[PDB]
Design a protein around this ligand. Structure first.
Ligand SMILES: *[C@@H]1O[C@H](CO)[C@@H](O)[C@H](O)[C@H]1NC(C)=O
Ligand SMILES: *[C@@H]1O[C@H](CO)[C@@H](O)[C@H](O)[C@H]1NC(C)=O
Ligand SMILES: *[C@@H]1O[C@H](CO)[C@@H](O)[C@H](O)[C@H]1NC(C)=O
Ligand SMILES: *[C@@H]1O[C@H](CO)[C@@H](O)[C@H](O)[C@H]1NC(C)=O
Ligand SMILES: *[C@@H]1O[C@H](CO)[C@@H](O)[C@H](O)[C@H]1NC(C)=O
Ligand SMILES: *[C@@H]1O[C@H](CO)[C@@H](O)[C@H](O)[C@H]1NC(C)=O
Lengths: 94, 238, 94, 238
């Protein structure tokens, strides 16, 4: 849960995220890497090392085109890969 | 004597590729309004005010809010309407917190390498923070109906004691105290009890917290870390 | 540039983005919407009405399967739509 | 006596759809390293350590930073090699500020309802912020070459004057003064002059600025708003 300087853009954002693996034996590509938000809350720009609770870590999603070798025969369905996290301001009721 | 029959089709229309020697005009006016059906469920209302050669009309709506969504509906015409002696339609399910860009064009439309595009209207769906749509399936499970009734008492300069009513949904809760900067941050765990349903949390604070703002964020598994929040203020208790 | 409370995430983010219209009479979808960062610098989580000079704004891009009506006939070429702005830390050397 | 030949192909392999009663094994080892070609160009070095029935192994390049990366090439063999008595490949460019995940699997591969996938290796490609990769075409315009010689002098408590060399690249400059919080903020426009290349900027400040860090931010049109900055410290000037 820290922000570095070189990057690229994954260790440089206020709410960083790490790339996790999802493997399948009939998908193109074989290896997909979703976005997983690591820091529960956004970090302070004063240091960039430690987190502050004033913000929220909310994922974003888009639909990616994948091909499935379902019994051979090919298949085309929309797939769900999280692209990146954003720091959104909270909702307060009352 | 025309009437409105409407359906669903998304993607390429058959007349989009084909050419047409003569082209209809265009929809002179177009309007959209939100109308709620009695029980909730919400459906979009599309009413436009409009020649002899004319076939149908297509409506496509796009939503862009933390997701991607795209739907289209074409409404056909039953028979020609020469008389001057204005239609409407109810055909789109509306989500929560979604901006909608809606545009319609007559079919057939302007041939390629020619001008005269259509016009569009815009509208933003009501959120979950209002009273009308606070009974939705998502909102209540996300915490719209829960009433924490926060009563936080400042014990002393360093410690603050917070009372809040619990719920069966969650067991761990955030805690924030913001006046100008962050002076209080803590994490707690509490088991839910039917006999006793009030919590007591002690949090250390740096600096004078008198008159601060108490912000309660629950850890409900169904809404992640971006869950709804409830207001609280430092109340001095004798 | 400012952050509102209802949403969605476009008027609620530290680096807000408004959607511009790119109308093409030979593209499917006929109307797309790129994200344009109205904030040159990131907003304070204290208010959200005013920005802070300690941050930077950067777009993210993706390849979205659109269709073009080139001479009619169908054809497939990726397009570079701007999804959202995210807040990224400065790079400082000397 | 096998030899290395490699082409390029992205998508589904002709053996991906087909099935095979007998399936070969897998690569014993695969190590990927970066190599530099003398003039610059940066290229990853792909080398795998490798039964009687076997044809080829595919190499793919995939990573993600602000973007995606996706390219795949094949690598045929010429003859079978029963002899017990190492292969390599140089065919892939390296981008700027991108992580890289390299994927390789023998052909043919395992059928459905089976095990034995391929492996992957990590790699972190440094950006152009290092002196070896400091003259690259893109960010050399973005300010790698420029030496500000930034010198900050404080006249009095309210104002600080900033002395630095101007460049023909930029005309409008923004500044940061950050020691504990933001105490200084201004925006100035200065035209570069061939006769005199040494400009003056006045930026008012709030509070005691002794010991602060003066930080410069140029609006060079090639780098937008994420341009490289240059560190400077306040110097008490007589
Ligand atoms: C309108 O006519 C087209 C022509 O085939 C047809 O495909 C479509 O289903 C019709 N619309 C409705 C609502 O039936
Ligand atoms: C959306 O509609 C509103 C209605 O006044 C208009 O002001 C705005 O320019 C429209 N925006 C787009 C992107 O169509
Ligand atoms: C908060 O809870 C504690 C639990 O022991 C209780 O003693 C205290 O009286 C409560 N606060 C108020 C204002 O009743
Ligand atoms: C590799 O072998 C395949 C299979 O015959 C062939 O189609 C392809 O052209 C070959 N590529 C090279 C570079 O030899
Ligand atoms: C990076 O290396 C570690 C161990 O060295 C491994 O566990 C991890 O899976 C690698 N990263 C990816 C994306 O595979
Ligand atoms: C900074 O620039 C101005 C420009 O005239 C000059 O007068 C001043 O002496 C410079 N600062 C120093 C320390 O020389």
């Amino acid at each position: 849960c820290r922000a570095s300087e070189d990057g690229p853009l994954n260790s440089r954002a206020i709410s960083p995220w790490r790339y996790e693996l999802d493997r399948d034996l009939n998908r193109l590509p074989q290896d997909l890497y979703h976005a997983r938000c690591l820091c529960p809350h956004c970090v302070s720009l004063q240091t960039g090392s430690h987190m502050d609770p004033r913000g929220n870590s909310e994922l974003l999603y888009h639909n990616q085109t994948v091909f499935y070798r379902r019994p051979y025969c090919l298949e085309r369905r929309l797939y769900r890969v999280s692209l990146a996290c954003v720091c959104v301001r909270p909702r307060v009721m009352g | 004597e025309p009437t409105v029959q409407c359906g669903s089709e998304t993607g390429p229309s058959p007349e989009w590729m084909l050419q047409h020697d003569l082209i209809p005009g265009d929809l002179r006016d177009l309007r959209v309004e939100p109308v709620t059906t009695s029980v909730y469920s919400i459906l979009m209302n599309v009413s436009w005010v409009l020649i002899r050669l004319l076939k149908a009309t297509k409506i496509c709506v796009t939503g862009k809010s933390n997701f991607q969504s795209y739907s289209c509906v074409r409404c056909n015409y039953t028979e020609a309407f020469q008389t001057q002696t204005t239609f409407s339609y109810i055909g789109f399910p509306v989500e929560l917190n979604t901006v909608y860009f809606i545009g319609a064009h007559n079919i057939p439309n302007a041939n390629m390498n020619e001008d005269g595009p259509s016009m569009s209207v815009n509208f933003t769906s009501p959120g979950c923070l209002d009273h009308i749509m606070k009974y939705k399936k998502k909102c209540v499970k996300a915490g719209s109906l829960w009433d924490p009734n926060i009563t936080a008492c400042k014990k002393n300069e360093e410690t603050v004691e917070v009372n809040f009513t619990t719920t069966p949904l969650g067991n761990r809760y955030m805690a924030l105290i913001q006046h100008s900067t962050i002076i209080g941050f803590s994490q707690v765990f509490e088991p839910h009890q039917k006999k006793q349903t009030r919590a007591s949390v002690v949090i250390p604070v740096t600096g004078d917290s008198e008159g601060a703002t108490v912000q309660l964020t629950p850890y409900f598994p169904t809404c992640g870390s971006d869950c709804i929040r409830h207001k609280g203020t430092v109340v001095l208790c004798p």
